[model samples]
Target: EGLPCKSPPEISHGVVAHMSDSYQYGEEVTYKCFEGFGIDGPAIAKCLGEKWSHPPSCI
Candidate 1:
């Protein structure tokens, strides 16, 4: 069975590409920066071990 993960963190000046009510292990999510802002880290994050991978920052 897959481990469940909580909602992903909100990014400053950024938005989640496809948000859901919940996440499960191995699931993926993507980030998008606001207009005039650029992403500073990995744009995609995966739910693993009941935690979300590192999310991107808007710069």
Candidate 2:
């Protein structure tokens, strides 16, 4: 089995799409900012070895 990762952290003024019941290594999720808000970082995050890569911020 692969290492499982916890849910990605939530961002203020933003929402996550493509969510699943659980995340396995290599899984990915996309982040989106609310209308009129801009994203401050990468919009995609991947699950890697029990952790998720950096998530985007809503600016």
Candidate 3:
């Protein structure tokens, strides 16, 4: 059998309807837009140095 393994590249940079769960390294996260707002793009953030690559934001 193969060993239990995982990956990195977590995406913690984006907007959410509500609070979500935490992600490990190499993980990914997607964002959405509201009725009036627009989705610029998926802010992909990785868990590096206890910080995220692209910080979450809304307009």
Candidate 4:
């Protein structure tokens, strides 16, 4: 009846919004790196199979 997937706290690091809340299947989550930080992976994560199939990292 609602979003089917949840992400880890790592997906929300330094961000105001949290992917830990939950997201719909195939939905996407995007994040911004804090000042002086960068992303090693894509800034987005997808909600897939009731889970975060790919979670990004802030490097």
TM-score, one value per model: 0.69, 0.67, 0.37, 0.53
- Deviating ranges (above 4 Å) for candidate 3: 1-14, 17-22, 43-45, 55-59
Please list the residue runs of candidate 2 whose C-alpha ends up more than 4 Å from where it truly belongs after superposition.
1-3
User: How high is the lDDT of residue 41 in model 2?
Assistant: 80
Per-residue CA lDDT of model 2 for 1-59, tens digit only, reads: 75667777765677787766776567778877788887788777777877677767777
Measured with C-alpha atoms, the lDDT of residue 15 in candidate 2 is 77
Q: Point out where model 1 deviates above 4 Å.
A: 1-3
Q: Counting only residues 3 or more apart in sequence or on different chains, how many pairs clash (N, Cα, C under 3 Å) in candidate 3?
A: 7
lDDT of 1 by residue, 37-59 (tens): 87688777777767677777777
Which wins on TM-score, candidate 2 or candidate 4?
2
Model 3, 1-59: lDDT tens per residue? 32222333332333444334655455444443445544454544444534445544444
Query: lDDT winner among the candidates?
Result: 1
Which rank order by TM-score, best down to worst? Answer: 1, 2, 4, 3
Of candidate 4, the 10-residue stretch with the lowest lDDT total is 8-17
RMSD of candidate 2 to true structure, Å: 2.4
